[PDB]
Amino acid sequence: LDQILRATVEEVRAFLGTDRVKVYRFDPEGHGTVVAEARGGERLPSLLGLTFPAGDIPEEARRLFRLAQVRVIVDVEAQSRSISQPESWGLSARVPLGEPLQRPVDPCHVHYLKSMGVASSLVVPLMHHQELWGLLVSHHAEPRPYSQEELQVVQLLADQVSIAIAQAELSL
Ligand SMILES: *[C@@H](C)[C@H]1/C(=C/c2[nH]c(/C=C3N=C(/C=C4/NC(=O)C(CC)=C4C)C(C)=C\3CCC(=O)O)c(CCC(=O)O)c2C)NC(=O)[C@@H]1C
Protein backbone atom coordinates (compact mmCIF):
# COMPACT_ATOMS: atom_id res chain seq x y z
CA LEU A 1 0.00 0.00 0.00
CA ASP A 2 2.79 2.41 0.95
CA GLN A 3 4.91 1.28 -1.99
CA ILE A 4 2.17 1.26 -4.63
CA LEU A 5 0.94 4.72 -3.68
CA ARG A 6 4.48 6.07 -4.02
CA ALA A 7 4.63 4.81 -7.60
CA THR A 8 1.18 6.23 -8.33
CA VAL A 9 2.27 9.81 -7.57
CA GLU A 10 5.28 9.57 -9.88
CA GLU A 11 3.35 8.85 -13.09
CA VAL A 12 0.49 11.17 -12.11
CA ARG A 13 2.65 14.30 -11.87
CA ALA A 14 4.26 13.39 -15.19
CA PHE A 15 0.87 13.37 -16.90
CA LEU A 16 -0.06 16.78 -15.48
CA GLY A 17 3.50 18.12 -15.35
CA THR A 18 2.34 19.90 -12.20
CA ASP A 19 4.99 21.16 -9.79
CA ARG A 20 3.71 18.95 -6.96
CA VAL A 21 1.13 16.20 -6.51
CA LYS A 22 0.66 14.09 -3.38
CA VAL A 23 -1.66 11.37 -2.13
CA TYR A 24 -3.31 11.75 1.27
CA ARG A 25 -4.99 9.02 3.33
CA PHE A 26 -7.74 9.48 5.92
CA ASP A 27 -7.53 7.74 9.31
CA PRO A 28 -10.65 6.87 11.40
CA GLU A 29 -9.67 9.47 14.02
CA GLY A 30 -9.54 12.30 11.47
CA HIS A 31 -5.75 12.44 11.18
CA GLY A 32 -4.02 11.81 7.86
CA THR A 33 -0.49 11.31 6.53
CA VAL A 34 1.43 12.02 3.33
CA VAL A 35 2.45 8.70 1.81
CA ALA A 36 3.09 9.83 -1.77
CA GLU A 37 4.69 13.00 -3.11
CA ALA A 38 6.51 14.14 -6.24
CA ARG A 39 8.43 17.40 -6.64
CA GLY A 40 8.80 19.46 -9.81
CA GLY A 41 12.54 20.12 -9.58
CA GLU A 42 12.61 20.29 -5.79
CA ARG A 43 10.66 23.51 -6.34
CA LEU A 44 8.36 22.63 -3.43
CA PRO A 45 9.54 21.04 -0.14
CA SER A 46 8.89 17.40 0.78
CA LEU A 47 6.03 17.05 3.28
CA LEU A 48 6.40 13.27 3.23
CA GLY A 49 5.70 11.62 6.58
CA LEU A 50 4.19 14.78 8.08
CA THR A 51 0.81 14.63 9.82
CA PHE A 52 -1.89 17.27 9.32
CA PRO A 53 -4.24 17.78 12.31
CA ALA A 54 -7.79 16.70 11.53
CA GLY A 55 -9.03 20.07 12.79
CA ASP A 56 -7.67 21.28 9.45
CA ILE A 57 -10.61 19.63 7.67
CA PRO A 58 -14.06 20.72 8.99
CA GLU A 59 -16.83 18.36 7.88
CA GLU A 60 -19.32 20.00 5.51
CA ALA A 61 -16.61 20.14 2.85
CA ARG A 62 -15.44 16.56 3.40
CA ARG A 63 -18.99 15.33 2.81
CA LEU A 64 -19.04 16.94 -0.63
CA PHE A 65 -16.07 14.85 -1.77
CA ARG A 66 -17.95 11.79 -0.54
CA LEU A 67 -21.25 12.91 -2.08
CA ALA A 68 -20.26 14.74 -5.27
CA GLN A 69 -16.54 14.11 -5.82
CA VAL A 70 -16.04 17.66 -7.11
CA ARG A 71 -13.92 20.50 -5.72
CA VAL A 72 -11.26 22.85 -7.07
CA ILE A 73 -9.51 26.02 -5.93
CA VAL A 74 -9.38 29.06 -8.22
CA ASP A 75 -6.64 31.66 -8.79
CA VAL A 76 -5.83 33.19 -5.41
CA GLU A 77 -5.40 36.41 -7.40
CA ALA A 78 -8.89 36.32 -8.93
CA GLN A 79 -9.95 36.93 -5.33
CA SER A 80 -12.74 34.36 -5.08
CA ARG A 81 -14.05 34.22 -1.51
CA SER A 82 -16.15 31.74 0.42
CA ILE A 83 -18.07 32.41 3.64
CA SER A 84 -20.13 30.60 6.26
CA GLN A 85 -23.65 31.53 7.38
CA PRO A 86 -25.57 31.67 10.70
CA GLU A 87 -26.61 28.14 9.75
CA SER A 88 -24.54 25.06 8.96
CA TRP A 89 -24.88 22.78 5.93
CA GLY A 90 -24.56 19.00 5.91
CA LEU A 91 -26.79 16.54 4.07
CA SER A 92 -27.77 19.54 1.95
CA ALA A 93 -24.92 18.43 -0.30
CA ARG A 94 -27.43 15.90 -1.63
CA VAL A 95 -27.78 18.55 -4.34
CA PRO A 96 -25.63 18.22 -7.52
CA LEU A 97 -23.30 21.20 -7.92
CA GLY A 98 -25.78 23.99 -8.64
CA GLU A 99 -23.08 26.68 -8.60
CA PRO A 100 -21.26 28.75 -11.28
CA LEU A 101 -18.41 27.16 -13.25
CA GLN A 102 -16.22 28.12 -10.29
CA ARG A 103 -15.86 27.25 -6.60
CA PRO A 104 -14.74 29.86 -4.01
CA VAL A 105 -12.76 28.91 -0.91
CA ASP A 106 -12.75 30.99 2.29
CA PRO A 107 -9.70 33.29 2.83
CA CYS A 108 -8.27 30.99 5.52
CA HIS A 109 -7.32 28.15 3.16
CA VAL A 110 -6.54 30.64 0.39
CA HIS A 111 -3.55 32.39 1.99
CA TYR A 112 -2.32 29.06 3.33
CA LEU A 113 -1.74 28.26 -0.33
CA LYS A 114 -0.14 31.64 -0.94
CA SER A 115 2.07 30.95 2.05
CA MET A 116 2.89 27.74 0.20
CA GLY A 117 3.68 29.52 -3.07
CA VAL A 118 0.55 28.00 -4.59
CA ALA A 119 -2.09 29.94 -6.54
CA SER A 120 -4.39 27.25 -7.93
CA SER A 121 -4.83 23.62 -6.87
CA LEU A 122 -7.10 20.89 -8.22
CA VAL A 123 -8.68 18.55 -5.68
CA VAL A 124 -9.68 14.96 -6.40
CA PRO A 125 -10.68 12.47 -3.65
CA LEU A 126 -10.04 8.75 -3.32
CA MET A 127 -13.13 6.79 -2.33
CA HIS A 128 -14.53 3.26 -2.41
CA HIS A 129 -18.27 2.59 -2.41
CA GLN A 130 -19.86 5.01 0.07
CA GLU A 131 -16.64 5.66 1.99
CA LEU A 132 -13.99 8.36 1.59
CA TRP A 133 -10.46 7.06 2.14
CA GLY A 134 -8.20 9.98 1.24
CA LEU A 135 -7.63 13.20 -0.68
CA LEU A 136 -5.57 13.84 -3.81
CA VAL A 137 -4.27 17.32 -4.60
CA SER A 138 -2.21 18.98 -7.32
CA HIS A 139 -0.38 22.28 -6.84
CA HIS A 140 0.03 24.87 -9.58
CA ALA A 141 2.14 27.90 -8.69
CA GLU A 142 0.69 29.77 -11.67
CA PRO A 143 -2.83 30.05 -13.20
CA ARG A 144 -3.75 26.84 -15.03
CA PRO A 145 -7.46 26.03 -15.64
CA TYR A 146 -8.44 22.37 -15.99
CA SER A 147 -10.08 20.75 -19.01
CA GLN A 148 -13.36 18.85 -18.70
CA GLU A 149 -11.72 15.89 -20.45
CA GLU A 150 -8.47 15.70 -18.46
CA LEU A 151 -10.46 16.24 -15.26
CA GLN A 152 -12.46 13.03 -15.72
CA VAL A 153 -9.59 10.78 -16.84
CA VAL A 154 -7.89 11.79 -13.59
CA GLN A 155 -11.07 11.56 -11.54
CA LEU A 156 -11.13 8.07 -12.99
CA LEU A 157 -7.47 7.50 -12.17
CA ALA A 158 -8.23 8.56 -8.61
CA ASP A 159 -11.23 6.25 -8.67
CA GLN A 160 -8.88 3.64 -10.09
CA VAL A 161 -6.55 4.40 -7.20
CA SER A 162 -9.35 4.50 -4.65
CA ILE A 163 -10.01 1.01 -5.96
CA ALA A 164 -6.39 -0.03 -5.49
CA ILE A 165 -6.29 0.98 -1.84
CA ALA A 166 -9.46 -1.06 -1.40
CA GLN A 167 -8.18 -4.16 -3.20
CA ALA A 168 -4.76 -3.91 -1.53
CA GLU A 169 -6.38 -3.57 1.90
CA LEU A 170 -7.74 -7.13 1.85
CA SER A 171 -4.13 -8.33 1.70
CA LEU A 172 -3.30 -6.95 5.14
C1 LIG B 1 -8.84 27.43 6.78
C2 LIG B 1 -7.80 26.30 6.85
C3 LIG B 1 -10.18 27.16 7.53
C4 LIG B 1 -11.08 26.15 6.79
C5 LIG B 1 -11.58 26.46 5.52
C6 LIG B 1 -11.45 25.64 4.39
N1 LIG B 1 -10.51 24.77 4.03
C7 LIG B 1 -11.06 23.76 3.36
C8 LIG B 1 -10.59 22.47 3.11
C9 LIG B 1 -9.29 22.18 2.65
N2 LIG B 1 -8.10 22.40 3.21
C10 LIG B 1 -7.12 21.88 2.48
C11 LIG B 1 -5.86 21.50 2.98
C12 LIG B 1 -4.77 20.74 2.51
N3 LIG B 1 -3.60 21.04 1.91
C13 LIG B 1 -2.70 20.11 2.29
O1 LIG B 1 -1.50 20.15 2.07
C14 LIG B 1 -3.36 19.09 2.98
C15 LIG B 1 -2.73 17.99 3.83
C16 LIG B 1 -2.00 16.94 2.99
C17 LIG B 1 -4.70 19.37 2.71
C18 LIG B 1 -5.81 18.30 2.64
C19 LIG B 1 -7.66 21.80 1.20
C20 LIG B 1 -7.00 21.97 -0.17
C21 LIG B 1 -9.01 21.55 1.40
C22 LIG B 1 -9.95 20.73 0.48
C23 LIG B 1 -10.00 19.24 0.83
C24 LIG B 1 -11.07 18.92 1.88
O2 LIG B 1 -11.91 18.04 1.59
O3 LIG B 1 -11.03 19.56 2.95
C25 LIG B 1 -12.30 24.21 2.90
C26 LIG B 1 -13.36 23.45 2.07
C27 LIG B 1 -13.54 24.00 0.65
C28 LIG B 1 -14.92 24.64 0.42
O4 LIG B 1 -14.93 25.81 -0.05
O5 LIG B 1 -15.92 23.97 0.70
C29 LIG B 1 -12.40 25.53 3.36
C30 LIG B 1 -13.36 26.61 2.82
N4 LIG B 1 -11.22 25.06 7.58
C31 LIG B 1 -11.07 25.43 8.88
O6 LIG B 1 -11.61 24.91 9.85
C32 LIG B 1 -10.11 26.61 8.93
C33 LIG B 1 -10.53 27.63 9.99
UniProtKB/TrEMBL annotation:
Q: Which terms are listed as keywords in the entry?
A: Kinase, Transferase
Top-level division of the source organism's lineage? Bacteria
- Positions with a binding annotation for (2R,3E)-phycocyanobilin: 24, 56, 71, 81, 106, 108-109
Q: Which protein are we looking at?
A: Sensor histidine kinase
Q: What is the originating organism of this protein?
A: Synechococcus sp. (strain JA-2-3B'a(2-13))
Q: Which residues of the full protein are shown?
A: 31 to 200 of 834
